[PDB]
Each structure stands twice: as structure tokens, then as C-alpha cells.
């Protein structure tokens, strides 16, 4: 929190669950959000919504 360690846990005390695993070495065991993959599409959506709203 605020880029300082406020707590620590063993494998016994905390679960981690990931749906979209990767073998990629630099993935470092983290997942992969569809929000990351689709981010361009979400931005394009937001822009087209703002465009249509800005008529009014």
C-alpha cells in the first residue's frame, strides 16, 4: 500500500487464482486481463460515445 509493504503471507495464509496463465518467462506468474487485451476497443467505444453525446 502506497508502495510500502504493510503485510506478508505464506502460501498457507493467502490464495492466488488466475484464469489466463502464461508460460512466458516475463509474465512472472501473473494473469492476463481481457481489459488489457481489449483496451483499444474500450477506448474506441468511449470515443464514439463521447462523439455521439457531444452533438448535444
Amino acid at each position: 500500500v502506497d508502495k510500502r509493504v504493510v503485510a506478508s503471507f505464506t502460501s498457507r495464509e493467502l490464495a492466488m487464482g488466475i484464469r489466463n496463465p502464461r508460460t512466458e518467462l516475463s509474465s512472472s506468474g501473473y494473469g492476463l486481463s481481457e481489459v488489457e487485451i481489449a483496451m483499444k476497443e474500450f477506448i474506441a467505444y468511449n470515443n464514439t460515445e463521447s462523439f455521439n453525446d457531444r452533438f448535444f
Binding site: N47, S50, F51, R54, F55
Partner: protein, 56 residues
Amino acid sequence: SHGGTTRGILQIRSDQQQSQHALENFKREWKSSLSGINGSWQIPVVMADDIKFVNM
């Protein structure tokens, strides 16, 4: 990959062509007022002798 996608040419015409300096600060007047989402619904007023747009 290689084409000209250019929609058309905006022909502005008067007794003589603008200097390059005049034309580049007209480009600044244009982009600061009309580009992107920020400019998206504004209309320029221009008082040239004649204005034409050629569809290519």
C-alpha cells in the same frame, strides 16, 4: 499499405496564394480549434473569395 487514402482537396482561392508562414499558422488556427474529439462539432468560418472541396 501503399495507397493514397486522401479524401479530397480543400481548394481555397484568392488573388494570391498565402505565404508558407501564413499557411502554417492557419494550420495552427485550424488544429487548435477543430482537431480530434475536442474540436469535433465546431465549424470554421472562413471568408476567402471562394472555397471548394474536390472529392478524390
